[PDB]
Symmetry: C2
Subunit: 133 residues, 2 copies
Amino acid sequence: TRDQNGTWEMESNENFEGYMKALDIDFHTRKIAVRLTQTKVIDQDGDNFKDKTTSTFRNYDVDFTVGVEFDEYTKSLDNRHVKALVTWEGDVLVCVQKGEKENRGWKKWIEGDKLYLELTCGDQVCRQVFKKK
Amino acid sequence: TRDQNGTWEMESNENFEGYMKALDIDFHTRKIAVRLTQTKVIDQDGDNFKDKTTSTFRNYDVDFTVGVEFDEYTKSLDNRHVKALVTWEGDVLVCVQKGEKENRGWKKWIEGDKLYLELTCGDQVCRQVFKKK
């Protein structure tokens, strides 16, 4: 069939590295790109095509229990080892990541249908907001 | 509420760059990471947390009509300009991307519930397989 309609989830990707290198892609981009999986949404009407592709990355699970310090390796970030301790402050989840980096941690809390996440390292604060599906 | 259960879709991300720089993240990784959106799946049982995060990237739409040559800028790859011509060979969609790179194109076809994609540049072939949702 010529009908390529649908959403297609990548299950295999061979020699993406060599294709990317043939295209002169920066080796730092290739090292990240070879990790990605793809979802392709094709809307097709006869010979008219619209191909909508999204690239996706694993990220490691993080499991913890409040009050129990755990070892965390920040793969997908700086790949460092920290000793993380999560505690409640009221309804705010507070994490201190003890390690090389000073003032490293995060705070996580719900308000309404929104999840707030504040990440700290040194004097830098990154504020992320998520909406509930 | 202390109940952080659910799947949470990132809608905002401020100063991720400065947080990442404070963590000494390679500037090539930061240039890609600042583009990503996040989906966070939290399974929470009391004070026991499992946080499953996936990072996601836009990728530009590509719309075309078979037989009509179109200009394509390969953002998300080498960011080059090519003149793309897509044609049918039986049930196989064949694209030649005329430009600086020799033997650059792709072939795309259905077999069963699987979509096959072969990308070529120079003497390099990348073969991708997708499964229908």
